[PDB]
């Protein structure tokens, strides 16, 4: 009754490379699970929005523009106000 989860297939070295890219210097060993959780949640949200938009458009394939449409609903995040 227990199936596999592909989110555990996203390796730790890639996570650490992403962290390094984000400017992190040292990380804990018990962080990867939470990371995978967050990744999966965001991906879920965007996929669901884009899929919804495609379905309503009455089409059988999600175009990259549908994904853009989905991401526009995610808002834009910056630093400061300008």
């Amino acid at each position: 009754k227990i199936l596999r989860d592909n989110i555990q297939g996203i390796t730790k070295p890639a996570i650490r490379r992403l962290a390094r890219r984000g400017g992190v210097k040292r990380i804990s060993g018990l962080i990867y699970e939470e990371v995978r959780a967050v990744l999966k949640s965001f991906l879920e949200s965007v996929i669901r929005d884009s899929v919804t938009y495609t379905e309503h458009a009455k089409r059988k394939t999600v175009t990259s523009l549908d994904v853009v449409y989905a991401l526009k609903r995610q808002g834009r995040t910056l630093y400061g106000f300008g």
Binding site: R16, R21, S28, V51, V62, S64, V67
Partner: protein, 92 residues
């Protein structure tokens, strides 16, 4: 207990390749689509875009996380730091 220091960025670059492998990401997307109960699937360009946004989101979230860890006067980031980074961004 698994605590790892990351390699120093000696110099940054402007355009950067993605870091997550194509196929694992793809089958993850297929899983998520599967569990959302839908019969349609993504274009390759669309999955490309998805990955771009995922990794962008992640780099930003890690920036916020590092910031939170700095404000706790630490160098090593923890789970709570990421949760805080999520809330900071504007999640629930």
């Amino acid at each position: 207990p698994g605590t790892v220091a990351l390699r120093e960025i000696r110099r940054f670059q402007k355009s950067t390749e993605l870091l997550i492998r194509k196929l694992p990401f793809q089958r993850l997307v297929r899983e998520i689509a599967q569990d959302f109960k839908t019969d349609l699937r993504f274009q390759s360009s669309a999955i490309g875009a998805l990955q771009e946004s995922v990794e962008a989101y992640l780099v930003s979230l890690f920036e916020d996380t590092n910031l939170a860890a700095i404000h706790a006067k630490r160098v090593t980031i923890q789970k709570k730091d990421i949760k805080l980074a999520r809330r900071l961004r504007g999640e629930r």
